[PDB]
UniProtKB/Swiss-Prot annotation:
This is Phosphoribosylformylglycinamidine synthase. It catalyses: N(2)-formyl-N(1)-(5-phospho-beta-D-ribosyl)glycinamide + L-glutamine + ATP + H2O = 2-formamido-N(1)-(5-O-phospho-beta-D-ribosyl)acetamidine + L-glutamate + ADP + phosphate + H(+). Keywords: ATP-binding, Cytoplasm, Glutamine amidotransferase, Ligase, Magnesium, Metal-binding, Nucleotide-binding, Purine biosynthesis. Residues 1031-1284 form the Glutamine amidotransferase type-1 domain. Pfam families: AIRS_C, FGAR-AT_linker, FGAR-AT_N, FGAR-AT_PurM_N-like, GATase_5. Its EC number is 6.3.5.3. One of its GO terms (cellular component) is cytoplasm. In the N-terminal section; belongs to the FGAMS family. Monomer. Phosphoribosylformylglycinamidine synthase involved in the purines biosynthetic pathway. Catalyzes the ATP-dependent conversion of formylglycinamide ribonucleotide (FGAR) and glutamine to yield formylglycinamidine ribonucleotide (FGAM) and glutamate. The lineage of its organism: Bacteria, Pseudomonadati, Pseudomonadota, Gammaproteobacteria, Enterobacterales.
Length: 1284
């Protein structure tokens, strides 16, 4: 369909069926639950193309082809009422941005913009007027989409509005009233003293302020941006305090400056790392090489609490996105490496899985439920991390909502406004740590996507692939070393350009003159205020010397990263924004005026302290307590938050959340290698204990620090001063007792605990409005969060290989408890108390600073000495949970006696005091106990018993059995929360299969069977000649797994060349010079239009490049490998590859969820030259994909493929049989197929990532006897030997 559309033409192309059977059934079932009699429903994707010029027959065919993607679902003829769901008018979906890029890269410049909607066909002849509105409501997100009655109504999405002019606020003509009116109208939230400041400022300038100027000032002076609370003077209980909160945090750096390279001077802190081989492609040669040099470590943690309460998916996604920009914009450019995620919400109240302690207290109509946040939120956060390409290796998840007698008496305390935390680490070059000076005349650039009106105002938008393109530019820049063109760089976040640019020039001691019309925009109707202040994502601002512009342009064009020079740095510290369209100046202000601060804040507050009531144990029994606690989400298995996120990208992940053969999510901390050629690395851990703040503020803070330390303790670090902390403070400022509580908590860690331990807090953030208000009936209600300190610990690691996990060994052993609680056994504010709807009397706390320090030092000694078999610290759920989780990870039993822990067994088992359980060889018990005593821990150390083969979890006290149960029974209970979450979020069949598998104790876990010598380097004789064949390491925009792929071929003797698709189109690289080629993994074009489709079609539609690939494949001796995204791409290039007529397609996983797993596969017999000598081998491999399901045309196609013998890899369960059961087979591929080859065996494509696990240290779990090389290194060596 082609119809007139403004100055353009809009083409409407019907797509493929949009909903799988279980999704359709889920909708129908939801209609009956609302009494809406719907007989049937059918959905179909519909595409809209805004054309600025005609498409000839060939181009039209290409467009239609581009829009043919997705699973081959059941098609039906439209019947019933049409309800078209599309993005809301005035908004452009990320799908649109990415789909339009593909169209352009396929030579279809006539396509102005591509957009997509979903056409629903509902058969229901009974519904009234309101019922139809209820049906429509169930088919769309009210915050992001709209429902239309005709496909033609999609024309509204492409309306071109004329540029709105700037508006002045008539201060000179109406007086102060004009500022008061503007304050209310524009929602400036200006204080009286700020209005006074602006009044004098403009009266002095003798002109009316423009709306844009007032808006810029208001955002810059918001609590979020200025951090007034953290810089305020204090008066506590009638006594003026010497330091501000920020000053007390800075005290930790003053006491411990050790290893710190940068703190409180950038968007992230930097600490010393290790000298290792930084691997990247040279600018002049394009060849990947190791560069021995210090890879310093950067760290940052941020939050996106408010946005997430309104729109969870975008809120969490941009939470990660904004934090990733902070990392890349550190110093003069840096590279993100790994991330962490945190979530705090109210009770889940899962339908049909209600827990005893949960009560519905209602909530504001304007926000989403805790369950909605934990459903869409994690997916959004993982969506950004997966698409951008950074592993998410650690995090926390707490649920809390209860009517408690706290500091301000009986009140509702919880997280209606959630904590959505995102952070991570990165690496940076020594000479790029410090920001450079900005020379006068420097070009001020905006790197990133075009602006839109996003700064409904709380609904964000994420395009991870755009940020990936930007990161590639930043990488090319720091990779130029001393030639790095970046003089200064900063991320664009709150306030948008209105905050970012003034801040950039100000930090350089310069001013700046900008041109409004030079900024890239996706919506012409935006006013100067909107263009300058919108909070559009994936944008960076930087300064570049004028003579370096041509080089910068070259770098951006090659990566397809949009950029625009929008201004120039000036000597005069003045801010000027000109508008060439309206011929005026929206902004004309001296920086000292715009950035001028109103009088410092002074908070005169008083201490409120809850009394705390003894725990009522009337309804409590140890057995029932165990069952309830394992059912608290905070304690329960976190699989639904772990497998949805990539944990292997970069190939530098040594320790992820999933532990052992049984892949149980219980790792206490994350560990990454510093490079692909070293055992040095980085570790991340989190400590948090918010509920404790409802009884004791300082205790909660001290415990957060303490837990971060106990979680990271079993990693080889050494000096405690190596551990650096990020302190993120969440609180309901102004709420009774919270202010004084915050000061006391900050003082407890900044002035006392951390300085005594030798811990620096060089970074941090604060969120001061953690409370929600609404009217339930006729009365007002409020939900206030406890003071919530989240401590994230980061540290350089001495040896990644020596990290211990909770996986118990069944060899002769001794289990020893290190009770830092010193027998206090506090039960206040514990999982046990919460589970029984109580708060308790007294909570845990750091009982002895010296012993905590001694504990860390003792653990470091034991780790370095290799005297530990396992370690698991105590936190939520207490000793009971610690022992249970170790039993789960080791898939064994436990026999322990707690008689020495006190007569109160409930308190002994459930207290959440600091400490944990170490497992040591029986023959080492005496020596270990002696070592602990040397650190003064003698009275805190207790021998509990031993881990034993079997399924019995037994706790005794002398001759009395305290608690006894099947370990498997506990394991399954502990898994029920993630089961229920997966069942409602994903394909229920898959969720059930994964859960049921856990109940089978006979599962042997991942295990290996090799058909060859893993240590035999069959490529060695070839490498020894010095002759190194080149391999084209192919990448398209969005590809993110190229570095490790290059490193794998390098290890095998190849000269890895970075070949971007732009290089092929530009003629800079020709495939005729290569004998080997590899298509890498990632999210090319964000997988829009089908994973690997845009990449493949951009090749097919550009006849010159299509011919280049076809010629390559048709040569007699060439070899090609396609992995993950590359496998999908090559499968869409069948027409160019000989012997590939039987290849299947790769579509959406049966689970309908991204699967990041460590799966067991078996190498099958095929012509594959890359798998030579490996047939019959069975070993685990990294799986990380959302569209890896093998899909054939029909069974004739499957039978043909199989009979031809082209299947090279198959998923097998732990018992060793080919399987289609989930998650053994993570995607649902028929006959477990996950790799196929051509008839001649010269081309092989596979979904798993061999290159992410070619190093043994990068294998989540692996046999203890393996050396540096894993089985997967053989693929690359086979390639080298084959080329000869
Ligand atoms: N939101 C989350 N995202 C990703 N991983 C998470 C999240 N919450 C917890 N995890 C991971 O799940 C495992 C168990 O979490 P948790 O029980 O909170 O750990 P601990 O008690 O050791 O602090 C850890 O490996 C942790 O990193
Ligand atoms: Mg835990
Ligand atoms: Mg722990
Ligand atoms: Mg924890």
């Amino acid at each position: 369909g082609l119809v007139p559309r403004g100055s353009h033409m809009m083409e409407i192309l019907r797509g493929s069926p949009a909903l799988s059977a279980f999704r359709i059934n889920k909708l129908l079932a939801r209609f009956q639950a609302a009494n809406l009699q719907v007989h049937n429903i059918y959905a179909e994707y519909v595409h809209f193309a805004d054309l600025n010029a005609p498409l000839n027959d060939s181009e039209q065919a290409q467009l239609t082809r581009l829009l043919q993607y997705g699973p081959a679902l059941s098609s039906h003829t439209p019947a019933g009422k049409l309800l078209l769901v599309t993005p809301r008018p005035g908004t452009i979906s990320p799908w649109s941005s990415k789909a339009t890029d593909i169209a352009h890269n396929c030579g279809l410049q006539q396509v102005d913009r591509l957009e997509r909607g979903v056409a629903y066909y509902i058969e229901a002849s009974t519904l009234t007027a309101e019922q139809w509105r209820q049906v429509a409501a169930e088919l769309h997100d009210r915050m992001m989409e709209t429902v239309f009655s005709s496909l033609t109504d999609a024309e509204k999405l492409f309306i071109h509005h004329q540029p709105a002019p700037v508006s002045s606020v008539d201060l000179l003509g109406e007086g102060r009233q004009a500022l008061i009116d503007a304050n209310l109208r524009l929602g400036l939230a200006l204080a009286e003293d700020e209005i006074d400041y602006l009044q004098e400022a403009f009266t002095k300038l003798g002109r009316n302020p423009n709306d844009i100027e007032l808006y810029m000032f208001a955002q810059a002076n918001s609590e979020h941006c200025r951090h007034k609370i953290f810089n305020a003077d204090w008066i506590i209980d009638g006594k003026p305090q010497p330091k501000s909160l920020f000053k007390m945090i800075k005290n930790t750096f003053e006491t411990t400056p050790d290893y710190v390279l940068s703190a409180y001077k950038d968007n992230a802190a930097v600490m010393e790392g290790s000298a290792v081989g930084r691997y990247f492609a040279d600018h002049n040669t394009g060849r990947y090489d190791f560069h021995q040099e210090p890879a310093h470590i950067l760290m940052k943690v941020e939050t996106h609490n408010h946005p997430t309460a309104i729109s969870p998916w975008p809120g969490a996604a941009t939470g990660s996105g904004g934090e990733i920009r902070d990392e890349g914009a550190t110093g003069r450019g840096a590279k993100p490496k790994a991330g962490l995620v945190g979530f705090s919400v109210s009770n889940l109240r899962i339908p049909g899985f209600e827990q005893p302690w949960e009560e519905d207290f209602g909530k504001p109509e304007r926000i989403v439920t805790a369950l909605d946040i934990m459903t869409e939120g994690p997916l959004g956060g993982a969506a950004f991390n997966n698409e951008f390409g950074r592993p998410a290796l650690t995090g926390y998840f707490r649920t809390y909502e209860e009517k408690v007698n706290s500091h301000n008496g009986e009140e509702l305390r919880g997280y209606h406004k959630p904590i959505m935390l995102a952070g991570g680490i990165g690496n940076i070059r020594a000479d790029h740590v410090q920001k450079g000076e900005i020379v006068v005349g420097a070009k001020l650039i905006v790197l990133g996507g075009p602006a839109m009106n996003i700064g409904f105002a709380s609904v964000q938008r994420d395009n991870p692939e755009m940020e990936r393109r930007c990161q590639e530019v930043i990488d090319r820049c720091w990779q130029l070393g001393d030639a790095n063109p970046i003089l200064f760089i900063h991320d664009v976040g709150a306030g948008g350009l209105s905050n970012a640019m003034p801040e950039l020039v100000s930090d350089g001691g310069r001013g700046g003159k900008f041109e409004l019309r030079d900024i890239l925009s996706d919506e012409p109707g935006m006013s100067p205020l909107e263009i300058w202040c919108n909070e559009s994502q994936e944008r960076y601002v930087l300064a570049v010397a004028a003579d370096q512009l041509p080089l910068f342009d070259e770098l951006c064009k090659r990566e397809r990263a949009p950029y625009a020079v929008i201004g120039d740095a000036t000597e005069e510290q003045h801010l000027s924004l000109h508008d060439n369209h309206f011929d005026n100046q929206p902004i004309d202000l001296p920086l000292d005026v715009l950035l001028g601060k109103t009088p410092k804040m002074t908070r005169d507050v008083q201490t409120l302290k809850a009394k705390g009531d003894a725990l009522n144990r009337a309804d409590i029994t140890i057995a029932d307590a165990v069952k309830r606690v394992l059912h608290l989400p905070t304690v329960a298995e976190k699989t639904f938050l772990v497998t949805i996120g990539d944990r292997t990208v970069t190939g530098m992940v040594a320790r992820d959340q999933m532990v052992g053969p049984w892949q149980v999510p219980v790792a206490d901390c994350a560990v990454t290698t510093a490079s692909l050629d070293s055992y040095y690395g980085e570790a991340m851990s989190i400590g948090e204990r918010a509920p404790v703040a409802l009884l004791d503020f300082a205790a909660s803070a001290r415990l957060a620090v303490g837990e971060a330390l106990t979680n990271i303790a079993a990693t080889q670090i050494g000096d405690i001063k190596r551990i650096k902390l990020s302190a993120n403070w969440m609180a309901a400022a102004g709420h009774p007792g919270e202010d004084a509580g915050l000061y006391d908590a900050v003082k407890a860690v900044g002035e006392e605990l951390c300085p005594q331990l030798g811990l620096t807090i060089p970074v941090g953030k604060d969120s001061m409005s953690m409370k929600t208000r609404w009217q339930e009936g006729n009365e007002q209600r409020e939900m206030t969060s406890p003071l919530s300190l989240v401590i994230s610990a980061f540290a350089r690691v001495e040896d990644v290989r020596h990290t211990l996990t909770p996986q118990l060994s069944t060899e002769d052993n001794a289990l020893l408890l290190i009770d830092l609680g010193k027998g206090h056994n506090a039960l206040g504010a514990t999982a046990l108390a919460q589970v029984y709807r109580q708060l308790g009397d007294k909570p845990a706390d750091v009982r002895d600073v010296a012993q905590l320090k001694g504990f860390y030092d003792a653990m470091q000694a034991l780790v370095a000495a290799r005297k530990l078999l396992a370690w698991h610290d105590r936190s939520d759920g207490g000793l009971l949970v610690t022992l249970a989780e170790m039993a789960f990870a080791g898939h064994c039993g436990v026999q322990v006696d707690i008689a020495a822990l006190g007569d109160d067994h409930l308190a002994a088992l459930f207290n959440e005091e600091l400490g944990g359980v170490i497992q040591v060889r029986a023959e080492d018990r005496d020596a270990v106990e002696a070592l602990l005593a040397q650190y003064g821990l003698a009275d805190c150390v207790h021998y509990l018993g031993q881990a034993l083969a079997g399924d019995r979890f037994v706790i005794t006290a002398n001759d009395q059995t305290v608690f006894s149960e099947s370990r498997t029974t506990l394991r399954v209970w502990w898994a029920e929360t993630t089961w229920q979450m997966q069942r409602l979020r994903d394909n229920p069949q898959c969720a059930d299969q994964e859960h049921e598998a856990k109940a089978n104790d006979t599962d042997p876990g991942l295990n290996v069977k090799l058909s060859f010598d893993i240590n035999e380097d069959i490529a060695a004789p070839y490498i020894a000649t010095g002759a190194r064949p080149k391999v084209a390491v192919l990448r398209e925009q969005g590809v993110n797994s190229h570095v490790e792929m290059a490193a794998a071929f390098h290890r095998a003797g190849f000269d890895a060349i970075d070949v971007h698709m732009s290089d092929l189109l530009g003629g800079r690289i020709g495939l005729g010079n290569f004998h080997a080629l590899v298509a890498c993994g990632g999210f090319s074009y964000g997988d829009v239009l089908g994973a690997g489709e845009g990449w493949a079609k951009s090749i097919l539609f550009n006849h010159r490049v299509r011919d280049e690939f076809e010629t390559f494949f048709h040569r007699p001796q060439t070899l090609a490998l396609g992995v993950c995204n590359g496998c999908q791409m090559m499968s869409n290039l069948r027409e160019l590859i000989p012997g590939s007529e039987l290849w299947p397609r790769f579509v959406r996983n049966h689970s309908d969820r991204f699967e990041a797993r460590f799966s067991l596969v078996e190498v099958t017999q095929s012509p594959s030259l890359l798998l030579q000598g490996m047939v019959g081998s069975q070993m685990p491999i990294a799986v990380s994909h959302g569209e890896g399901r093998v899909e054939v045309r029909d069974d004739a196609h499957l039978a043909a493929l199989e009979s031809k013998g082209l299947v090279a890899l198959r998923y097998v369960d732990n018992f060793g049989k080919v399987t289609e059961t989930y998650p053994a087979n993570p995607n649902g591929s028929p006959n477990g197929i996950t790799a196929v080859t051509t008839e001649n065996g010269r081309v092989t494509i596979m979904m798993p990532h061999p290159e992410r696990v070619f190093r043994t240290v990068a294998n989540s779990w692996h046999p203890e006897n393996w050396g540096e090389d894993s089985p997967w290194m053989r693929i690359f060596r086979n390639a080298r030997k084959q080329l000869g």
